[PDB]
Amino acid sequence: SALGKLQDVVNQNAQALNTLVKQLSSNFGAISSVLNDILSRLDPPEAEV
Amino acid sequence: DSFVIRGDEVRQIAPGQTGKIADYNYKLPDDFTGCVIAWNSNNLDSKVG
């Protein structure tokens, strides 16, 4: 734990990037988190929503 | 835009509709602004034969 100050910065940046990646798997109330599934399953008036 | 249609086809004169005269006779855009006007004309546009 001698170099914990640099490792904290590296871990915070990597964990923030991982959280930003994992936010793509959330639908945020939509029917799916994949844009291709929405564009292939729905007409554009509801796929727009 | 003036035409004569059936009574059940008046729902197809609208943005974002799936339907028959919407696809092959008269299509409205998704960003359509304006008014659709419909009234019964059985006394004028109909014959007993």
mmCIF file of C-alpha atoms in Angstrom:
data_model
loop_
_atom_site.group_PDB
_atom_site.id
_atom_site.type_symbol
_atom_site.label_atom_id
_atom_site.label_comp_id
_atom_site.label_asym_id
_atom_site.label_seq_id
_atom_site.Cartn_x
_atom_site.Cartn_y
_atom_site.Cartn_z
ATOM 1 C CA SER A 1 0.000 0.000 0.000
ATOM 2 C CA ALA A 2 2.952 2.346 -0.552
ATOM 3 C CA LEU A 3 1.704 3.656 -3.922
ATOM 4 C CA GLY A 4 -1.976 3.810 -2.986
ATOM 5 C CA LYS A 5 -2.366 7.452 -4.022
ATOM 6 C CA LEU A 6 -1.627 6.732 -7.691
ATOM 7 C CA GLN A 7 -3.580 3.470 -7.579
ATOM 8 C CA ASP A 8 -6.635 5.320 -6.245
ATOM 9 C CA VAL A 9 -6.566 7.694 -9.237
ATOM 10 C CA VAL A 10 -6.129 4.786 -11.680
ATOM 11 C CA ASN A 11 -8.939 2.806 -10.017
ATOM 12 C CA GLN A 12 -11.292 5.811 -9.982
ATOM 13 C CA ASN A 13 -10.719 6.524 -13.685
ATOM 14 C CA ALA A 14 -11.115 2.859 -14.676
ATOM 15 C CA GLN A 15 -14.218 2.440 -12.509
ATOM 16 C CA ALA A 16 -15.797 5.600 -13.948
ATOM 17 C CA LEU A 17 -15.132 4.311 -17.477
ATOM 18 C CA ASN A 18 -16.604 0.918 -16.546
ATOM 19 C CA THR A 19 -19.712 2.592 -15.099
ATOM 20 C CA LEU A 20 -20.083 4.661 -18.284
ATOM 21 C CA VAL A 21 -19.878 1.431 -20.298
ATOM 22 C CA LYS A 22 -22.403 -0.365 -18.061
ATOM 23 C CA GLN A 23 -24.895 2.493 -18.393
ATOM 24 C CA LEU A 24 -25.400 1.411 -22.031
ATOM 25 C CA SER A 25 -27.013 -1.858 -20.909
ATOM 26 C CA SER A 26 -29.862 -0.004 -19.163
ATOM 27 C CA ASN A 27 -33.066 0.687 -21.078
ATOM 28 C CA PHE A 28 -34.026 3.724 -18.895
ATOM 29 C CA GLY A 29 -37.688 2.742 -19.087
ATOM 30 C CA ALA A 30 -37.657 1.760 -22.761
ATOM 31 C CA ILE A 31 -38.525 -1.721 -24.013
ATOM 32 C CA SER A 32 -34.879 -2.617 -24.728
ATOM 33 C CA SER A 33 -31.369 -1.244 -24.315
ATOM 34 C CA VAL A 34 -30.475 -2.116 -27.933
ATOM 35 C CA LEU A 35 -31.292 0.427 -30.637
ATOM 36 C CA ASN A 36 -31.386 -2.275 -33.328
ATOM 37 C CA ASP A 37 -34.079 -4.221 -31.453
ATOM 38 C CA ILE A 38 -36.244 -1.099 -31.158
ATOM 39 C CA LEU A 39 -35.705 -0.149 -34.812
ATOM 40 C CA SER A 40 -36.528 -3.702 -35.955
ATOM 41 C CA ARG A 41 -39.480 -4.357 -33.617
ATOM 42 C CA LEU A 42 -41.358 -1.043 -33.839
ATOM 43 C CA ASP A 43 -42.500 1.483 -36.394
ATOM 44 C CA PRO A 44 -40.692 4.894 -36.286
ATOM 45 C CA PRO A 45 -43.555 6.762 -34.470
ATOM 46 C CA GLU A 46 -43.052 4.665 -31.316
ATOM 47 C CA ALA A 47 -39.406 3.810 -31.969
ATOM 48 C CA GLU A 48 -38.830 7.580 -31.874
ATOM 49 C CA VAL A 49 -40.209 7.653 -28.312
ATOM 50 C CA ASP B 1 -56.684 17.456 -50.395
ATOM 51 C CA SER B 2 -60.195 16.233 -51.170
ATOM 52 C CA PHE B 3 -61.266 12.607 -51.591
ATOM 53 C CA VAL B 4 -64.020 10.149 -50.636
ATOM 54 C CA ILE B 5 -63.300 7.079 -48.488
ATOM 55 C CA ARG B 6 -65.115 4.592 -46.261
ATOM 56 C CA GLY B 7 -66.253 5.245 -42.705
ATOM 57 C CA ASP B 8 -63.702 2.939 -41.079
ATOM 58 C CA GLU B 9 -60.802 4.332 -43.146
ATOM 59 C CA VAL B 10 -60.978 7.807 -41.567
ATOM 60 C CA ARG B 11 -58.582 6.614 -38.874
ATOM 61 C CA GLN B 12 -55.957 6.076 -41.585
ATOM 62 C CA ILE B 13 -55.860 9.797 -42.501
ATOM 63 C CA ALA B 14 -53.377 10.555 -39.716
ATOM 64 C CA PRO B 15 -49.610 10.728 -39.129
ATOM 65 C CA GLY B 16 -47.931 7.485 -38.147
ATOM 66 C CA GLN B 17 -50.789 5.154 -39.078
ATOM 67 C CA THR B 18 -50.537 1.679 -40.528
ATOM 68 C CA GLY B 19 -53.339 1.008 -42.958
ATOM 69 C CA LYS B 20 -54.313 0.561 -46.557
ATOM 70 C CA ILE B 21 -55.135 3.971 -48.043
ATOM 71 C CA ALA B 22 -52.344 5.334 -45.838
ATOM 72 C CA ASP B 23 -49.818 3.190 -47.711
ATOM 73 C CA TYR B 24 -51.182 3.009 -51.265
ATOM 74 C CA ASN B 25 -53.556 5.975 -51.660
ATOM 75 C CA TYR B 26 -52.769 8.942 -49.387
ATOM 76 C CA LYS B 27 -49.868 9.242 -46.934
ATOM 77 C CA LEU B 28 -49.414 11.959 -44.280
ATOM 78 C CA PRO B 29 -45.936 12.788 -42.925
ATOM 79 C CA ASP B 30 -44.910 12.296 -39.313
ATOM 80 C CA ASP B 31 -44.386 16.070 -38.946
ATOM 81 C CA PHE B 32 -47.770 16.872 -40.513
ATOM 82 C CA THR B 33 -49.483 20.071 -39.396
ATOM 83 C CA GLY B 34 -53.040 20.915 -40.367
ATOM 84 C CA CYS B 35 -56.543 19.541 -39.973
ATOM 85 C CA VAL B 36 -58.374 16.481 -41.283
ATOM 86 C CA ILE B 37 -62.071 17.039 -42.014
ATOM 87 C CA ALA B 38 -64.525 14.194 -42.522
ATOM 88 C CA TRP B 39 -68.281 14.162 -42.911
ATOM 89 C CA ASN B 40 -70.881 11.634 -43.997
ATOM 90 C CA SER B 41 -72.026 11.888 -47.620
ATOM 91 C CA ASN B 42 -74.428 8.973 -47.957
ATOM 92 C CA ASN B 43 -77.100 11.327 -49.321
ATOM 93 C CA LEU B 44 -74.821 12.534 -52.145
ATOM 94 C CA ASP B 45 -72.092 9.962 -52.902
ATOM 95 C CA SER B 46 -74.286 6.852 -52.922
ATOM 96 C CA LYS B 47 -76.783 5.245 -55.286
ATOM 97 C CA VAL B 48 -79.340 2.501 -54.712
ATOM 98 C CA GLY B 49 -77.893 0.551 -57.650
#
